[PDB]
Structure 1
Amino acid sequence: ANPYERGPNPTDALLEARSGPFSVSEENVSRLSASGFGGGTIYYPRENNTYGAVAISPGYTGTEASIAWLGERIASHGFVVITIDTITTLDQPDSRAEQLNAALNHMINRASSTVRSRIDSSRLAVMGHSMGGGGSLRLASQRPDLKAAIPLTPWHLNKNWSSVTVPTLIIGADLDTIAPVATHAKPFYNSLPSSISKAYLELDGATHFAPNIPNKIIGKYSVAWLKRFVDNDTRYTQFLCPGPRLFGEVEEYRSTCPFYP
């Protein structure tokens, strides 16, 4: 048995719903409390257990409010999730990487016992929007111990992520004019090694700000990815492989399925 399985057996409907099956509570992290980032909100399951932990960064000019929906939604499927504010809203991607790292450490070592006791510190993941997605890639390159990375409409001046070995799902937006998929998301996906677990999901009829707007596709695939890789939960492979490779929803889906089942 996989000791990290949590929650009931999944279905497409369960993953598309506004909320997952875990009741969620919140712990605020003030800017004072945060060391190396701007504070945030930790969402976690009310039901005591150990869970994987996830840190999510907003993008340039963004605050935690722009990613709150994702923090709550992911936590409601059985994760401890911090949505951060950055030191300043204008911080660049490599700074955001360091801030994601500080936020993971905060959850593990500095939060209340209620939060710390709900984390398996060996099972961590990062996500981010735009420059925060760039930060997720950078930290993944630095931290091969991370279990998953999910860059959402990511932006970064470096396109070469051949050093990344962490299971990475990149979500792009077809109509993104800020971090165009042709010059950001796709170059990143293609430079990730062919040998790793990876996938590219491009949203149809989506702007750069799709990740800041509650979105059943982002929710479903983000949770399925975190489940598969943070929890080793092969009950979720079914959603990822072959995956949505869906007009009105998904423009394209590429992967290295089936990820060595």
Structure 2
Amino acid sequence: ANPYERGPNPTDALLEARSGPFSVSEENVSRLSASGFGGGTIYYPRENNTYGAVAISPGYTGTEASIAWLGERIASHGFVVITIDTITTLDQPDSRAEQLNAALNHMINRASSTVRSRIDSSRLAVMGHSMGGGGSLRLASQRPDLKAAIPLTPWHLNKNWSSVRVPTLIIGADLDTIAPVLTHARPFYNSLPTSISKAYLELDGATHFAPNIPNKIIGKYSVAWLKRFVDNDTRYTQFLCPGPRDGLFGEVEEYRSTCPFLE
């Protein structure tokens, strides 16, 4: 038995629903209380248990409102999730990496006892939009103990992520003009090692802002990746391997992976 399995055996409907099977509560993190980031919102399952924890960063000029839906959706599948504001809206990716790390340490050490009692501090993940996604790659390269990273339409001047040893799903947007996939997402994916669990999902008919509103594909595969790697939950491998169908008449523009993933 894997002790980290939470919730029912998954279906496409379970992952495409607007909410997961867990009811969620929220805790505000004031900018005054936040050490090393700008505050945020913690979403957590009401059901008392331990869960993996996830920190999510917005991008340049972005606020926590740009990523709130995804914190709430992921928490509803059995995770403790913090959506942050950064110290300033103009912070660069490597500053965002430090703020992600600070947000993980906040959830583990400084949130309410209601939140801290629901966290398995050994099972952590990071995500982010745009510069936030660049920050996710940077922190993942520094912290091989993270269980997953999910950069969403990532932006970073560093193209070489050969040092990353964390299971990483990069989601790109085909029509992205801010972080074009030819110069950001695809080079990032191609530089990740062939020896890690990794995937690249390029959305069809998507701008750079696709992650900022509820999106069935982003929510399905984000949750499947977190389940597979944060919870070691091999019930979710079915969604990732061989993964969504791509090209002409597909669900996505492109999907690449290193399937099969080691257990």
TMscore range, shorter length: over 0.9
After superposition, the CA RMSD in angstroms is 0.8
Give TM-score, length-normalised by structure 1.
0.99
Q: Is the Cα contact below 8 Å between 1:107 and 1:116 reproduced in 2?
A: yes
**1:120 equivalent in structure 2:** 120
Runs of 4+ in 1 over 3 A off after TM superposition: 245-249
Q: TM-score scaled by structure 2?
A: 0.98
CA distance in 1, matches of 2:250, 2:206: 9
Report SS of the residue matched to 1:156.
coil
Instruction: Give a deviation string over 1:220-244, Cα, whole Å, max 9, x none.
Output: 0000000000000000000000001
Distance in structure 1 (CA, Å) of the matches to 2:260 and 2:44: 30
Instruction: Please report how far the alpha carbon of residue 248 of structure 1 lies from its aligned counterpart in structure 2 after TM superposition.
Output: 6.6
The superposition leaves residues 111-160 of structure 1 with CA deviations (integer Å, 9 ceiling, x where unpaired) of: 00000010000000000000000000000000000000000000000000
- The question of 1:229 aligning with 2:229 is answered yes
Counterparts of 2:78 and 2:206, CA distance in 1: 27
Q: Secondary structure at the match of 2:100?
A: helix
Q: Closer, same or farther in 2 for the Cα pair 1:213/1:247, shift >3 Å?
A: farther
Partners of 2:16 and 2:219 within 8 A in 1: yes
- The reply on whether 1:100 has 2:80 as its aligned counterpart is no
* Alpha-carbon shift at residue 247 of structure 1 (Å): 3.6
2:152–2:211 Cα contact (<8 Å) kept: yes
Measure the CA separation in 2 of the matches of 1:244 and 1:225: 13
CA shift in 2, pair 1:47/1:92, >3 Å? same
Post-superposition CA distance 1:146-202 (Å, at most 9, x none): 000000000000000000000000000000000000000000000000000000000
Rounded Cα–Cα distance in structure 1 between residues aligned with 2:130 and 2:10: 29
Contact 1:204–1:247 at 8 Å: present in 2 too? no
Kept after mapping to 1: 8 A contact 2:244/2:251: no
May I ask how many residue pairs the two structures share in their alignment?
A: 261
* 1:1-47 deviation per Cα after TM superposition (whole angstroms, max 9, x unaligned): 10000001110011001000000000000001100000000000000
* CA distance, structure 1, for counterparts of residue 223 and residue 94 of structure 2: 25
CA separation of 1:248/1:69 partners in 2, compared to 1, >3 Å: closer, same or farther?
Answer: farther
> In structure 2, do the counterparts of structure 1 residues 259 and 248 end up closer, same or farther at CA, with 3 Å as the change threshold?
closer
CA deviations 1:50-88 (Å, max 9, x no partner) are 000000000000000000000000000000000000000
Identity of aligned residues (%): 98
Partner SS for 1:187 = helix
Gaps of 5+ in 1: none
In 2: Cα distance, 1:249 partner to 1:214 partner: 16
- 3-state SS, counterpart of residue 10 of structure 2: coil
Q: Which runs of 5+ in 2 are unaligned?
A: none
* SS of alignment partner, residue 253 of structure 2: strand
